[PDB]
Amino acid sequence: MHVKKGDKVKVITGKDKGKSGKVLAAFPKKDRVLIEGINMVKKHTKPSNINPQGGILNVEAPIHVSNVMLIDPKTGEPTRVGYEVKGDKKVRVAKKSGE
RNA sequence: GAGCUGUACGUAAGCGUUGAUCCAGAGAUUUCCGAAUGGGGGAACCCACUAUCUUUAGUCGGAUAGUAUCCUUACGUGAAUACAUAGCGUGAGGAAGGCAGACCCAGGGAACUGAAACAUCUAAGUACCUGGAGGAAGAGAAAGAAAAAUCGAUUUCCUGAGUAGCGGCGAGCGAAACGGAAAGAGCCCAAACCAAGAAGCUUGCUUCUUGGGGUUGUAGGACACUCUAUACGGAGUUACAAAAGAAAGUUAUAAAUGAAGCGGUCUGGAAAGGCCCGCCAAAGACGGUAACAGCCCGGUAGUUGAAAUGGCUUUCCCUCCAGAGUGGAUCCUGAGUACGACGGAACACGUGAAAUUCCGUCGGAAUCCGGGAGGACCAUCUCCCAAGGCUAAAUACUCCCUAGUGACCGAUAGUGAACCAGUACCGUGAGGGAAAGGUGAAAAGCACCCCGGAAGGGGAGUGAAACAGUUCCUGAAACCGUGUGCCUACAAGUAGUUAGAGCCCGUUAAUGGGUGAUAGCGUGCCUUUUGUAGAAUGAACCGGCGAGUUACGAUUUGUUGCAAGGUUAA
RNA sequence: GGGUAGCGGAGAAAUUCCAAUCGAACUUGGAGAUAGCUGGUUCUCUCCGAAAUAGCUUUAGGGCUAGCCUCGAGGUAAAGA
RNA sequence: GGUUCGUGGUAGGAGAGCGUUCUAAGGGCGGUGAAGUCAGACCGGAAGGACUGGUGGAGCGCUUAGAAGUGAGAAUGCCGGUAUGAGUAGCGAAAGAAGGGUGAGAAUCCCUUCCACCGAAUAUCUAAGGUUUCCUGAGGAAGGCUCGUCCGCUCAGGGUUAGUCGGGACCUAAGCCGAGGCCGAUAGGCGUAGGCGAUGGACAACAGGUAGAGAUUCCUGUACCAGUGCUAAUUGUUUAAC
RNA sequence: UAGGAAGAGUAGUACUGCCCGUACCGCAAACCGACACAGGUAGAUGAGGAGAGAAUCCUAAGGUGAGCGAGAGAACUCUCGU
RNA sequence: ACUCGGUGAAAUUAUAGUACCUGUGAAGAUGCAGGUUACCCGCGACAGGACGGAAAGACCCCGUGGAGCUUUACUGCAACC
Ligand SMILES: [Mg+2]
Ligand SMILES: [Mg+2]
Ligand SMILES: [Mg+2]
Ligand SMILES: [Mg+2]
Ligand SMILES: [Mg+2]
Ligand SMILES: [Mg+2]
Ligand SMILES: [Mg+2]
Ligand SMILES: [Mg+2]
Ligand SMILES: [Mg+2]
Ligand SMILES: [Mg+2]
Ligand SMILES: [Mg+2]
Ligand SMILES: [Mg+2]
Ligand SMILES: [Mg+2]
Ligand SMILES: [Mg+2]
Ligand SMILES: [Mg+2]
Ligand SMILES: [Mg+2]
Ligand SMILES: [Mg+2]
Ligand SMILES: [Mg+2]
Ligand SMILES: [Mg+2]
Ligand SMILES: [Mg+2]
Ligand SMILES: [Mg+2]
Ligand SMILES: [Mg+2]
Ligand SMILES: [Mg+2]
Ligand SMILES: [Mg+2]
Ligand SMILES: [Mg+2]
Ligand SMILES: [Mg+2]
Ligand SMILES: [Mg+2]
Ligand SMILES: [Mg+2]
Ligand SMILES: [Mg+2]
Ligand SMILES: [Mg+2]
Ligand SMILES: [Mg+2]
Ligand SMILES: [Mg+2]
Ligand SMILES: [Mg+2]
Ligand SMILES: [Mg+2]
Ligand SMILES: [Mg+2]
Ligand SMILES: [Mg+2]
Ligand SMILES: [Mg+2]
Ligand SMILES: [Mg+2]
Ligand SMILES: [Mg+2]
Ligand SMILES: [Mg+2]
Ligand SMILES: [Mg+2]
Ligand SMILES: [Mg+2]
Ligand SMILES: [Mg+2]
Ligand SMILES: [Mg+2]
Ligand SMILES: [Mg+2]
Ligand SMILES: [Mg+2]
Ligand SMILES: [Mg+2]
Ligand SMILES: [Mg+2]
Ligand SMILES: [Mg+2]
Ligand SMILES: [Mg+2]
Ligand SMILES: [Mg+2]
Ligand SMILES: [Mg+2]
Ligand SMILES: [Mg+2]
Ligand SMILES: [Mg+2]
Ligand SMILES: [Mg+2]
Ligand SMILES: [Mg+2]
Ligand SMILES: [Mg+2]
Ligand SMILES: [Mg+2]
Ligand SMILES: [Mg+2]
Ligand SMILES: [Mg+2]
Ligand SMILES: [Mg+2]
Ligand SMILES: [Mg+2]
Ligand SMILES: [Mg+2]
Ligand SMILES: [Mg+2]
Ligand SMILES: [Mg+2]
Ligand SMILES: [Mg+2]
Ligand SMILES: [Mg+2]
Ligand SMILES: [Mg+2]
Ligand SMILES: [Mg+2]
Ligand SMILES: [Mg+2]
Ligand SMILES: [Mg+2]
Ligand SMILES: [Mg+2]
Ligand SMILES: [Mg+2]
Ligand SMILES: [Mg+2]
Ligand SMILES: [Mg+2]
Ligand SMILES: [Mg+2]
Ligand SMILES: [Mg+2]
Ligand SMILES: [Mg+2]
Ligand SMILES: [Mg+2]
Ligand SMILES: [Mg+2]
Ligand SMILES: [Mg+2]
Ligand SMILES: [Mg+2]
Ligand SMILES: [Mg+2]
Ligand SMILES: [Mg+2]
Ligand SMILES: [Mg+2]
Ligand SMILES: [Mg+2]
Ligand SMILES: [Mg+2]
Ligand SMILES: [Mg+2]
Ligand SMILES: [Mg+2]
Ligand SMILES: [Mg+2]
Ligand SMILES: [Mg+2]
Ligand SMILES: [Mg+2]
Ligand SMILES: [Mg+2]
Ligand SMILES: [Mg+2]
Ligand SMILES: [Mg+2]
């Protein structure tokens, strides 16, 4: 996966195409990403110990990784990513000669 | 290089950039049963002995190591029996069992079937049982093939050829050499002779061990002399003798880097699609992503990379090494064998005119002035030296691993098994042996209200769709129902067809559709039969599945190429 | 609790019993044994269209040759009715 | 394109075609709705082919060739589903009645009283065999030939105590295995020493208590068998207690 | 008896004694019969009246009322009584 | 058995709006011809027909089918002399 937890994201396709957000979790076992404010769902949950009043809950749902491009940190555009050896560790370098 | 504690949701409790989970190489641990091996046993259990250590005041308990049988070989003991042997004990090596339902070598070895019956024959040295291996096995360096001339170990393929032959001369069985190819490789002993030991002393001999020599058919060798070489040179663990160690390179087992569109716009739940524009390409393989993507993701072409272990190839190291000529006086060249009689078998070859090879039982040679073969046998000629052993490649198969391919299947198909399948179930047992795939892009898997004990419903909500609500994509037919337009309670009916009023509708628009009072005619489908409505056979109904195919030969017709020529096989 | 096993065992004898099976158990294989016998064999139209006879047959409800059908090609002193 | 003669047909011969799956090339349509499925009064000489509308929600035709697992109404055909007989036969030996209780619901569950049946058994133990069926708290989909609030059914937690009972560490019978050994194409068969093997031989515990589930086992009282150490006397020591 | 022998018994005290089975059914709805099946299943105990008796009828201790019912009282079939 | 409440099969089955007489026919007809009868739908009963159901006749014949048995059938084998 080219996207990790804590990065900034621009969504490319889907019903919520064209917006931005910050990744909250990653599921590399199944190629899913959870981004705040994207792909909200309404869960009909019974009352229980969690959320004692129950009711309809409005929470995010995971989306596929391919629907996500990592925005350029300095300029602010989605871009493909490349790897360079800086120091003794591999860093991620954009296609606009950035980080 | 950022998440992780499997399938498996979940709660709980935790660990991770001081680098976790994960991937690859090398190690450590490895309960009990099972060859099972200390004894026993009804599988995974029971009971021990001998030494050392250990706890208790001591019994009781614990830990560690050894203890099966057979073969080979050393040492010690040691009976009838005097020496001695058998037996007994100790030590050191080896074996045992499994399987890949494949391939192949040996021992033993059927029947159904065909012959239109059957016994010789066939099926067939097949199925099967047993033993032995190997990654291949078997065969293999002429006592050969053949003929007016030659070849030069074996194996496999194409031809020879369905030829020569065998055959109750029936059904059938059926070669080989020459010729063309793949692959190619040659060697080691026994015996004469020499040197040393001990022994029977078969007593001045022989007879065993050890080492050297030497292995062939124009005969070779021993034996004698002329030459050189004792590492000058050569060879090697795939035969030719055998065991180790390094250096380099390559490869197999994890991986790294890797170009170009978030282009605009339309429909849409969502764009990879339509239309209009760009770019990359040694990369337009494949898969995923909310519908069909070279430019979104994992990747692809290309270029890189291995700490560790294995394979392979060279080099070093290491090891080991005599080969030519001439005379050949004299000696050696595989004995209870080669052959022969009798009884069988294998050879394409069934006792036949029966050569060749092998087994059981009897008899039984020559040995270089010698021996065998050339399909009975004799003479001549030609070829060749048995009764010892080893040897890679070309060939057969696939339980497996890696990378791919298909005018191969697509859930009654394809493996018996796409799913916790040799399972459930059946049988005392060996053994037999199933059924069973699909919500959605994402659980967003229906909060809340109402009827009910619940199940199940009606709203509401999510979703593009709930007539996608947990056999959940599609959802045919048999079968079971609800509503209705036309007909039906004086009628004798293979249920229809032709004529036809009345009533009800309105089409792929044409001398249309539905139902039908009444009238004429009319004994189902299949199979098998001289002949069936048949009181002859089969089918309860619906659905799926279910029967002239392929390989190699023969013959005849059609088409195409060449034509007294045509055509290649491996 | 044990012994006898199928080319075999046991039988005061009946072809009697050997796991609801016995004039020769059950299971797997040879094996898709063989069947001159019965059953079945799936779309359509066009043209032609029989035989149920002779001889031989371990033959008689099977087969072979001839007779009858169909398709293609030939040659005439035209041979058929 | 014309003239003449023809066109019933089983076994059977000959010819021309339709339709299905897959492949190759050309050319196409399809989220503005593909295949499949349902309904129509359309077209062709037949097998068959379109068009329109509903359902469906992602693939499919056309042209010319090629290759076949190539077309089903019948095989007492194989597998699946669903009918008719039909609300029919049956519901597996037997005596029940009423009153209270529980519950959404009671002939069928619980309690009480009366009645009835077995009684060399339909009673009490205990081997084989079964393998959790035992007890408690919940449950009512399926099983129970009806019903069920119940159950040998479903779910979750529990429950089996030994020096003396039965069996091993004791013994042997029939039988089985069997070092060496004898026999035999292989495999193996037989068998000596030795050993396994109860249905038999020997061997030390009795009486009460136990309100969810064990009792010669746990608990109480009183015992026995084998062995060990610690104390106190006794005796014996290599013509030699034991 | 062969053998082993310098320790031996006696009395009192305290301590040690391993493994396997143990629930429940067991003439039965829990075993063998495909079934909650009128069949089959070894052994010990097995009371009273009358009686020779473990026969026979009625009962004790103890255990049961049998897993479809109610109501009518036809033919016919089965098991019984005159 | 019969009526009522609960539960609920099976063999069979080409589709059926399924009369009688005399005749015809593969020679014994609910279904063919000519006549004679007969309003529609059931419940309890009886067994004359559906050449009724079950079991590819066991009697009979056939197959160049099988198996068990016999002997002075043919050819063999063990065993024994
Ligand atoms: Mg072995
Ligand atoms: Mg025979
Ligand atoms: Mg025969
Ligand atoms: Mg073998
Ligand atoms: Mg070899
Ligand atoms: Mg042969
Ligand atoms: Mg890229
Ligand atoms: Mg676009
Ligand atoms: Mg879609
Ligand atoms: Mg001979
Ligand atoms: Mg001989
Ligand atoms: Mg000769
Ligand atoms: Mg020759
Ligand atoms: Mg000759
Ligand atoms: Mg050899
Ligand atoms: Mg399907
Ligand atoms: Mg299958
Ligand atoms: Mg079983
Ligand atoms: Mg899905
Ligand atoms: Mg509900
Ligand atoms: Mg629908
Ligand atoms: Mg779908
Ligand atoms: Mg339907
Ligand atoms: Mg009238
Ligand atoms: Mg009328
Ligand atoms: Mg009309
Ligand atoms: Mg005929
Ligand atoms: Mg006839
Ligand atoms: Mg009839
Ligand atoms: Mg017939
Ligand atoms: Mg029938
Ligand atoms: Mg043929
Ligand atoms: Mg030609
Ligand atoms: Mg027995
Ligand atoms: Mg036996
Ligand atoms: Mg035997
Ligand atoms: Mg006998
Ligand atoms: Mg008799
Ligand atoms: Mg008897
Ligand atoms: Mg055969
Ligand atoms: Mg056949
Ligand atoms: Mg005609
Ligand atoms: Mg015949
Ligand atoms: Mg003929
Ligand atoms: Mg004439
Ligand atoms: Mg015609
Ligand atoms: Mg034809
Ligand atoms: Mg298709
Ligand atoms: Mg459609
Ligand atoms: Mg087919
Ligand atoms: Mg059918
Ligand atoms: Mg069926
Ligand atoms: Mg009836
Ligand atoms: Mg009744
Ligand atoms: Mg009853
Ligand atoms: Mg009551
Ligand atoms: Mg009584
Ligand atoms: Mg009695
Ligand atoms: Mg028991
Ligand atoms: Mg049981
Ligand atoms: Mg249970
Ligand atoms: Mg209970
Ligand atoms: Mg219930
Ligand atoms: Mg019930
Ligand atoms: Mg229970
Ligand atoms: Mg006690
Ligand atoms: Mg005991
Ligand atoms: Mg005992
Ligand atoms: Mg032995
Ligand atoms: Mg023995
Ligand atoms: Mg003995
Ligand atoms: Mg014993
Ligand atoms: Mg006993
Ligand atoms: Mg005792
Ligand atoms: Mg109890
Ligand atoms: Mg007690
Ligand atoms: Mg009991
Ligand atoms: Mg039972
Ligand atoms: Mg009952
Ligand atoms: Mg019973
Ligand atoms: Mg008395
Ligand atoms: Mg009495
Ligand atoms: Mg009482
Ligand atoms: Mg009752
Ligand atoms: Mg009745
Ligand atoms: Mg009733
Ligand atoms: Mg007839
Ligand atoms: Mg007549
Ligand atoms: Mg008549
Ligand atoms: Mg009539
Ligand atoms: Mg009636
Ligand atoms: Mg009748
Ligand atoms: Mg009949
Ligand atoms: Mg018959
Ligand atoms: Mg015979």
Q: How far is CA A71 from CA A3, A39, A80, in A?
A: 10, 19, 9
What residue type is A40 in one-letter code?
A: M
Q: CA A79, CA A7: separation in Å to the nearest integer?
A: 13
| CA A11 to chain CA centroid, nearest Å | 8
Q: Which residues of A are annotated as a binding site for Mg(2+)?
A: 66
Which tokens sit at A53?
A: 């009043």
Range list of β-strands (E), chain A: 8-11, 20-27, 32-35, 40-45, 55-60, 63-64, 68-70, 81-86, 89-94
Q: How far is CA A39 from CA A13, A61, A85, A87, in A?
A: 12, 6, 36, 39
A2 touches strand B (CB under 7 A): yes
How many Å apart are A41 CA and D130 C1'? 58
Residue with tokens 């490349």: A82
Q: Burial of A38 by CB count in 10 Å (0-12 exposed, 13-18 middle, 19+ buried)?
A: buried
CA of A37 to the centre of ligand 48 (A): 44
Could you say which residues 9-48 of protein chain A have a Cβ atom less than 7 A away from any atom in strand B? 10, 12-18, 25-29, 31, 39, 41-47
Identify the experimental approach: cryo-EM
How many Å apart are A61 CA and B263 C1'? 30
| CA A95 to chain CA centroid, nearest Å | 20
Q: CA A46, CA A61: separation in Å to the nearest integer?
A: 19
Question: Which resolution, in Å, applies to this structure?
Answer: 3.0
- The answer to whether the beta carbons of residues A64 and A32 sit under 8 Å apart is yes
